[PDB]
């Protein structure tokens, strides 16, 4: 986890992991957030890219989460929250946990069929 984070205490880490991949017989997974690690690192490795997830899907997922905790909430509020977090799932989930367990923001009725 975070192969990109290297300290002076972490001496010879890239050479070390080079030796690991060189001599392994078990699966090894490297994860990071920077795109630059792909170019500076030398070796043979399969690449897997996670794109930013779709806003409406994670909005529906967060809305199911708040529905399970006995809260009904509009989609557009979660869309604003996600775009404010640049669609970060853990940020939106944690702030939703804080804002739900605080008792909710504003009690306003909204009759929607698409209580």
């Amino acid at each position: 986890e975070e192969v990109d984070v290297i300290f002076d205490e972490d001496a010879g880490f890239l050479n070390a992991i080079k030796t690991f991949m060189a001599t392994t017989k078990r699966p090894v997974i490297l994860t990071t957030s920077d795109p630059t690690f792909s170019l500076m690192f030398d070796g043979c490795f399969e690449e897997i890219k996670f794109s930013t997830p779709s806003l409406l899907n994670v909005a529906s997922y967060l809305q199911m989460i708040c529905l399970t905790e006995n809260f009904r909430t509009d989609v557009k509020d979660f869309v604003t929250l996600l775009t404010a977090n640049t669609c970060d799932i853990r940020k939106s989930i944690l702030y939703l946990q804080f804002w739900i367990r605080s008792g909710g923001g504003v009690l306003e009725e909204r009759p929607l069929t698409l209580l």
């Binding site: 986890e1 001496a11 880490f13 070390a16 030796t19 001599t23 078990r26």
Partner: protein, 39 residues
């Protein structure tokens, strides 16, 4: 993790046999995740 000590000699001496051998406990409590460290 970067939070733990990850120097080359230490990581090689305490993690090579994870991929060069079998697992001593292949049954029972196996789906736990020990964070590898050296304090």
């Amino acid at each position: 993790n970067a939070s733990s000590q990850r120097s080359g000699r230490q990581i090689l001496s305490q993690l090579k046999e994870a991929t060069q051998s079998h697992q001593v406990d292949k049954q029972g409590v196996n789906s736990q995740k020990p964070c590898f460290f050296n304090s």
